[PDB]
């Protein structure tokens, strides 16, 4: 059935609950499946269709839904007006102590795609959870077409593995990891003239996307 989260919940990428997949903010809706494995149960968050594993203890942090989640729609022009608020969310998040948390979604500690999802949700707009899904979902544009509030994608030939929010003037805001990044939220530029972090990510640049609708996944 469908439930509302009474507290922020961790969802894991396996029944073993050793690696975080996403986090569900208080008030989100999820569906609990009959697939229980080990000490966990498979769930699927409603707003982004994102699957993961919930500890069986956390079932007491759910309240049954009698009104099912339905996604809101926005026109392209409505979305344009909301982009400044998404940007502002990221700027404020950068100012709170934070590190790069794989699966971090509720804050203050984000992963790259989790920051994007949280920023857009703050203005009412849903994105899918993972970077490759955010690229599939958004309207592909060229690098040269980037405008503030568009998403910047980085990764392998197979898929995007990283994402940031374009600010203008080649600059973007993102959460990035330890090995090549800042271990948290910061500013980089799409230029080989940038600093070593900027250069590292620039080498992996894949594409760019514009948010032209709010995500409305399929009801399973």
Tab-separated table of C-alpha atoms in Angstrom:
chain	number	residue	atom	x	y	z
A	1	UNK	CA	0.000	0.000	0.000
A	2	UNK	CA	0.852	3.706	-0.014
A	3	UNK	CA	2.099	5.466	3.054
A	4	UNK	CA	3.308	8.908	4.167
A	5	UNK	CA	6.640	9.192	5.903
A	6	UNK	CA	6.387	10.462	9.483
A	7	UNK	CA	10.182	10.959	9.762
A	8	UNK	CA	13.007	11.129	7.243
A	9	UNK	CA	13.828	7.587	6.113
A	10	UNK	CA	16.922	5.943	4.702
A	11	UNK	CA	16.487	3.671	1.703
A	12	UNK	CA	19.283	1.257	0.821
A	13	UNK	CA	20.398	-0.307	-2.455
A	14	UNK	CA	20.166	-3.901	-1.099
A	15	UNK	CA	18.474	-5.797	1.698
A	16	UNK	CA	21.713	-5.727	3.634
A	17	UNK	CA	21.334	-2.001	4.140
A	18	UNK	CA	25.012	-1.220	3.783
A	19	UNK	CA	24.864	1.392	1.024
A	20	UNK	CA	22.412	4.233	0.916
A	21	UNK	CA	20.347	4.680	-2.224
A	22	UNK	CA	18.223	7.697	-1.340
A	23	UNK	CA	16.533	9.352	1.657
A	24	UNK	CA	12.833	10.141	1.910
A	25	UNK	CA	11.956	13.468	3.495
A	26	UNK	CA	9.142	13.708	6.020
A	27	UNK	CA	5.815	13.851	4.200
A	28	UNK	CA	6.854	11.908	1.110
A	29	UNK	CA	4.762	9.059	-0.114
A	30	UNK	CA	6.033	5.559	-0.639
A	31	UNK	CA	4.654	2.225	-1.463
A	32	UNK	CA	5.559	-0.759	0.553
A	33	UNK	CA	5.846	-3.996	-1.491
A	34	UNK	CA	5.407	-7.600	-0.300
A	35	UNK	CA	9.087	-8.289	-1.132
A	36	UNK	CA	10.800	-8.773	2.218
A	37	UNK	CA	14.378	-9.978	2.217
A	38	UNK	CA	16.505	-10.376	5.343
A	39	UNK	CA	15.522	-7.627	7.778
A	40	UNK	CA	14.308	-5.222	5.064
A	41	UNK	CA	11.379	-4.676	2.719
A	42	UNK	CA	11.456	-3.300	-0.821
A	43	UNK	CA	9.697	0.012	-1.229
A	44	UNK	CA	9.233	2.496	-4.043
A	45	UNK	CA	9.022	6.251	-3.484
A	46	UNK	CA	5.966	7.641	-5.310
A	47	UNK	CA	7.211	10.999	-6.574
A	48	UNK	CA	10.239	9.669	-8.438
A	49	UNK	CA	9.461	5.960	-8.756
A	50	UNK	CA	12.731	5.271	-6.983
A	51	UNK	CA	13.105	1.791	-5.500
A	52	UNK	CA	15.047	0.777	-2.459
A	53	UNK	CA	15.151	-1.183	0.782
A	54	UNK	CA	13.650	-0.044	4.023
A	55	UNK	CA	14.612	-1.521	7.390
A	56	UNK	CA	11.657	-3.400	8.841
A	57	UNK	CA	11.975	-1.307	12.058
A	58	UNK	CA	11.133	1.777	10.164
A	59	UNK	CA	7.630	0.526	9.281
A	60	UNK	CA	6.356	2.254	12.387
A	61	UNK	CA	7.404	5.589	10.869
A	62	UNK	CA	4.764	5.235	8.143
A	63	UNK	CA	1.149	6.412	8.176
A	64	UNK	CA	-1.306	4.926	5.656
A	65	UNK	CA	-2.324	7.212	2.803
A	66	UNK	CA	-6.010	7.515	1.990
A	67	UNK	CA	-5.248	10.149	-0.698
A	68	UNK	CA	-2.691	8.807	-3.203
A	69	UNK	CA	0.122	10.991	-4.499
A	70	UNK	CA	-0.542	12.612	-7.843
A	71	UNK	CA	2.082	14.690	-9.540
A	72	UNK	CA	1.604	18.379	-10.247
A	73	UNK	CA	2.255	19.716	-13.729
A	74	UNK	CA	3.960	22.960	-14.688
A	75	UNK	CA	4.323	24.728	-18.017
A	76	UNK	CA	7.743	25.597	-19.409
A	77	UNK	CA	7.208	29.261	-18.549
A	78	UNK	CA	6.151	28.414	-14.991
A	79	UNK	CA	9.295	26.388	-14.508
A	80	UNK	CA	11.508	29.241	-15.802
A	81	UNK	CA	10.157	31.440	-13.012
A	82	UNK	CA	11.020	28.859	-10.383
A	83	UNK	CA	14.655	28.317	-11.404
A	84	UNK	CA	16.009	31.149	-9.246
A	85	UNK	CA	14.606	29.424	-6.161
A	86	UNK	CA	16.274	26.117	-7.077
A	87	UNK	CA	19.575	27.968	-7.456
A	88	UNK	CA	19.092	29.764	-4.157
A	89	UNK	CA	18.470	26.415	-2.406
A	90	UNK	CA	21.842	25.125	-3.573
A	91	UNK	CA	23.655	28.302	-2.553
A	92	UNK	CA	22.226	28.101	0.949
A	93	UNK	CA	23.049	24.399	1.181
A	94	UNK	CA	26.680	25.220	0.291
A	95	UNK	CA	26.852	27.466	3.348
A	96	UNK	CA	25.957	24.705	5.828
A	97	UNK	CA	28.637	22.279	6.949
A	98	UNK	CA	28.368	19.304	4.535
A	99	UNK	CA	30.302	16.416	3.113
A	100	UNK	CA	29.686	14.149	0.089
A	101	UNK	CA	27.276	11.423	1.260
A	102	UNK	CA	26.444	8.701	-1.273
A	103	UNK	CA	22.660	8.556	-1.311
A	104	UNK	CA	22.370	11.877	0.554
A	105	UNK	CA	19.064	13.497	-0.298
A	106	UNK	CA	17.482	15.269	2.709
A	107	UNK	CA	20.477	17.414	3.711
A	108	UNK	CA	22.756	18.731	4.895
A	109	UNK	CA	24.989	16.069	3.323
A	110	UNK	CA	24.193	15.421	-0.369
A	111	UNK	CA	25.389	13.449	-3.323
A	112	UNK	CA	25.414	15.220	-6.647
A	113	UNK	CA	22.016	14.065	-7.928
A	114	UNK	CA	20.416	14.245	-4.498
A	115	UNK	CA	21.281	17.933	-4.277
A	116	UNK	CA	19.587	18.492	-7.656
A	117	UNK	CA	16.449	16.602	-6.616
A	118	UNK	CA	16.232	18.472	-3.293
A	119	UNK	CA	16.775	21.893	-4.923
A	120	UNK	CA	13.991	21.403	-7.445
A	121	UNK	CA	11.615	19.916	-4.876
A	122	UNK	CA	12.052	23.100	-2.856
A	123	UNK	CA	10.243	24.933	-5.673
A	124	UNK	CA	7.714	22.130	-6.288
A	125	UNK	CA	9.402	20.459	-9.230
A	126	UNK	CA	10.245	16.758	-9.240
A	127	UNK	CA	13.238	15.245	-10.937
A	128	UNK	CA	14.186	11.565	-11.009
A	129	UNK	CA	16.769	10.600	-8.383
A	130	UNK	CA	19.856	9.481	-10.290
A	131	UNK	CA	22.000	11.501	-12.660
A	132	UNK	CA	21.463	9.220	-15.646
A	133	UNK	CA	17.714	9.436	-15.089
A	134	UNK	CA	17.880	13.218	-14.827
A	135	UNK	CA	19.667	13.300	-18.187
A	136	UNK	CA	17.084	11.020	-19.800
A	137	UNK	CA	14.286	13.019	-18.395
A	138	UNK	CA	15.453	16.595	-19.201
A	139	UNK	CA	15.453	18.113	-22.691
A	140	UNK	CA	18.927	17.624	-24.155
A	141	UNK	CA	20.660	20.853	-25.187
A	142	UNK	CA	24.153	21.729	-26.355
A	143	UNK	CA	26.795	23.020	-23.934
A	144	UNK	CA	26.626	26.376	-25.640
A	145	UNK	CA	22.901	26.612	-24.979
A	146	UNK	CA	23.295	26.303	-21.199
A	147	UNK	CA	21.387	28.904	-19.208
A	148	UNK	CA	21.040	29.385	-15.437
A	149	UNK	CA	19.000	26.570	-13.915
A	150	UNK	CA	19.869	23.968	-16.540
A	151	UNK	CA	21.567	20.711	-15.524
A	152	UNK	CA	25.150	19.875	-16.517
A	153	UNK	CA	25.989	16.187	-16.927
A	154	UNK	CA	29.307	14.351	-16.629
A	155	UNK	CA	30.189	10.684	-16.891
A	156	UNK	CA	31.367	7.764	-18.927
A	157	UNK	CA	30.352	6.961	-22.522
A	158	UNK	CA	27.685	4.784	-21.083
A	159	UNK	CA	25.962	7.169	-18.757
A	160	UNK	CA	26.008	10.276	-16.631
A	161	UNK	CA	27.527	9.642	-13.218
A	162	UNK	CA	27.606	13.251	-12.045
A	163	UNK	CA	25.413	16.359	-12.360
A	164	UNK	CA	25.504	20.029	-11.402
A	165	UNK	CA	23.283	23.113	-11.674
A	166	UNK	CA	24.404	25.721	-14.168
A	167	UNK	CA	24.692	29.292	-12.827
A	168	UNK	CA	25.986	31.234	-15.825
A	169	UNK	CA	29.387	32.306	-17.140
A	170	UNK	CA	30.534	28.686	-17.344
A	171	UNK	CA	29.969	28.238	-13.597
A	172	UNK	CA	27.954	25.507	-11.936
A	173	UNK	CA	27.203	24.370	-8.402
A	174	UNK	CA	27.440	20.719	-7.392
A	175	UNK	CA	28.221	18.313	-4.591
A	176	UNK	CA	31.331	16.341	-5.428
A	177	UNK	CA	33.313	13.500	-3.868
A	178	UNK	CA	36.689	13.086	-2.376
A	179	UNK	CA	38.822	11.613	-5.083
A	180	UNK	CA	38.421	14.381	-7.689
A	181	UNK	CA	36.105	16.805	-5.966
A	182	UNK	CA	35.511	18.958	-2.928
A	183	UNK	CA	33.887	16.434	-0.538
A	184	UNK	CA	30.753	18.527	-0.583
A	185	UNK	CA	29.089	21.472	-2.297
A	186	UNK	CA	31.093	23.994	-4.300
A	187	UNK	CA	31.476	25.985	-7.477
A	188	UNK	CA	33.317	24.879	-10.582
A	189	UNK	CA	33.718	26.108	-14.157
A	190	UNK	CA	33.388	24.349	-17.496
A	191	UNK	CA	36.891	25.226	-18.622
A	192	UNK	CA	40.292	23.643	-18.854
A	193	UNK	CA	41.516	27.007	-17.439
A	194	UNK	CA	39.747	26.380	-14.128
A	195	UNK	CA	41.453	24.890	-11.059
A	196	UNK	CA	42.350	21.196	-10.751
A	197	UNK	CA	38.860	20.196	-9.570
A	198	UNK	CA	37.221	22.087	-12.414
A	199	UNK	CA	39.599	20.490	-14.906
A	200	UNK	CA	38.948	16.993	-13.555
A	201	UNK	CA	35.176	17.354	-14.036
A	202	UNK	CA	35.532	19.179	-17.346
A	203	UNK	CA	37.340	16.181	-18.789
A	204	UNK	CA	34.216	14.107	-17.995
A	205	UNK	CA	31.649	16.561	-19.435
A	206	UNK	CA	28.859	14.685	-21.260
A	207	UNK	CA	25.907	16.920	-21.929
A	208	UNK	CA	23.358	19.434	-20.695
A	209	UNK	CA	19.631	19.354	-20.055
A	210	UNK	CA	16.802	21.821	-19.610
A	211	UNK	CA	13.964	21.155	-17.132
A	212	UNK	CA	10.838	21.451	-19.281
A	213	UNK	CA	8.347	19.530	-17.126
A	214	UNK	CA	8.031	18.165	-13.605
A	215	UNK	CA	8.473	14.403	-13.341
A	216	UNK	CA	5.295	12.347	-13.457
A	217	UNK	CA	6.186	8.708	-13.279
A	218	UNK	CA	4.018	5.794	-13.921
A	219	UNK	CA	1.811	4.341	-11.214
A	220	UNK	CA	2.866	0.668	-11.036
